[PDB]
Amino acid sequence: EMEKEFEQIDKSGSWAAIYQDIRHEASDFPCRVAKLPKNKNRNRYRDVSPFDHSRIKLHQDNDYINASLIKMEEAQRSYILTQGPLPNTCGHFWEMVWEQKSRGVVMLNRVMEKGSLKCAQYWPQKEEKEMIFEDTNLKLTLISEDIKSYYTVRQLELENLTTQETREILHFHYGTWPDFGVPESPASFLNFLFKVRESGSLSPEHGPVVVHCSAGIGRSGTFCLADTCLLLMDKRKDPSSVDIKKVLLEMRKFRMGLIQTADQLRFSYLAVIEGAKFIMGDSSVQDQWKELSHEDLE
């Protein structure tokens, strides 16, 4: 059971040891397409690559994009984890969103972090300045945005200019999650996660939600681990039946390096334990997260 195991790891100060134990057991699968010379400029980070067996293929030409399908069989939820698109891969990114029928995009980083450019500016910032990705023949329009104190929700219109079919994509942009760090509180993380959940973006009627940060493994892995653990617990209505470390190891069969620090692992435990209160029927804790997260400020 998570609470007892969590209390033990703190009491012994062994989060680092628990975390390398997961690094050491994680799966190792080949990434030969990602390492092809013709794909070097499609990878943001030399050491962050999708496994061949789970990589998303574009229906083009060159089908490579740095993105992985995390298919959680038991939870019955899939996610697409991907790096922050580069200047030359923004068209690929939206082609993947289109082809995979995703409804939601979860962005856990800022475009500029810590001095450096972690993500291209791949969505329009003004309604009147739409973007056209010439190479993939898609048009992208900012329809509206709801700016909260530490995150922003945007409605975008994605249009395939070939067919002139159009889709509404929701963009969930977490603004205050430092790279290699943790959210300010479980409440602010869970308040955000439940905004994504309530949008319908995670429904099985849609394609997999697209989740990214800069590399698509650290913050992105933390978000997916927490969500999947809560969903597994929700389906069984049994918190004590969730083995978080085995869930993480299952996810790392599909993408390397998910969760980059022991403290991100520790935070995942904190989010799931707190989120269990909502899952097991204390509805009022959601509005309590909304308060603690100070979303309504500025």
Breaks in the chain at C–N > 2.5 Å: after which residues? 60
Q: Which stretch binds ligand VO4 (CB under 6 A): 17-25, 29-37, 55-63, 207-215?
A: 207-215
* Least Å from the CB of residue 296 to ligand VO4: 26
Give yes or no for a contact between 33 and 55, defined as CB atoms under 8 angstroms apart: yes
Fill in the per-residue mask, 56 to 85: x = in contact with ligand VO4 (CB under 6 A), - = not in contact. Answer: ------------------------------
Q: Is 219 in the site for ligand VO4 (CB under 6 A)?
A: yes
Give yes or no for a contact between 249 and 3, defined as CB atoms under 8 angstroms apart: no
Shortest Cβ contact with ligand VO4: which residue?
Answer: 218
Q: According to DSSP H, which parts of the chain are helical?
A: 2-12, 15-25, 90-100, 186-198, 218-236, 244-251, 262-279, 285-292
* Least Å from the CB of residue 298 to ligand VO4: 25
Q: Is 214 in the site for ligand VO4 (CB under 6 A)?
A: yes
218 is in an annotated binding site: yes
Q: Is 141 in the site for ligand VO4 (CB under 6 A)?
A: no
181 is in an annotated binding site: no
Distance (Å) of CA 96 to CA 62, 70, 219, 228, 294: 13, 15, 21, 22, 34
Helix, strand, coil distribution of the chain in percent, nearest 5: 35, 20, 40
Residue 125: phi, psi to the nearest 5?
-90, -15
- Choice from 156, 215, 224, 232 touching ligand VO4 (CB under 6 A): 215
262 is in an annotated binding site: no
* Least Å from the CB of residue 151 to ligand VO4: 15
Rounded CA-CA distance 279/231 in Å is 9
Distance (Å) of CA 193 to CA 47, 183, 268, 297: 28, 12, 12, 19
- Choice from 218, 224, 250, 262 touching ligand VO4 (CB under 6 A): 218
Unique residue bearing structure tokens 């602010």? 188
Active site residue 213: yes
The residue (of 69 and 217) whose beta carbon lies closer to ligand VO4 is 217
From the candidates 90, 213, 224, 229, give the one annotated as an active-site residue.
Answer: 213
Q: Which stretch binds ligand VO4 (CB under 6 A): 185-193, 215-223, 236-244, 288-296?
A: 215-223
**Binders in 235-264 for ligand VO4, by CB under 6 A:** 260
115 is in an annotated binding site: no
229 is in an annotated binding site: no
Give yes or no for a contact between 51 and 68, defined as CB atoms under 8 angstroms apart: yes
Distance (Å) of CA 105 to CA 3, 92, 170: 31, 14, 6
CA 272 to chain centre: 16
Q: What is the SS3 assignment for 286?
A: helix
Q: Which stretch binds ligand VO4 (CB under 6 A): 62-70, 218-226, 230-238, 242-250?
A: 218-226
Fill in the per-residue mask, 161 to 200: x = in contact with ligand VO4 (CB under 6 A), - = not in contact. Answer: ------------------x---------------------
Instruction: Name the site residues for ligand VO4 (rule: CB under 6 A).
Output: 109, 179, 213-220, 260
Q: Can you say which residues are annotated as belonging to the binding site for substrate?
A: 179, 213-219, 260
Residues carrying an active site annotation: 213
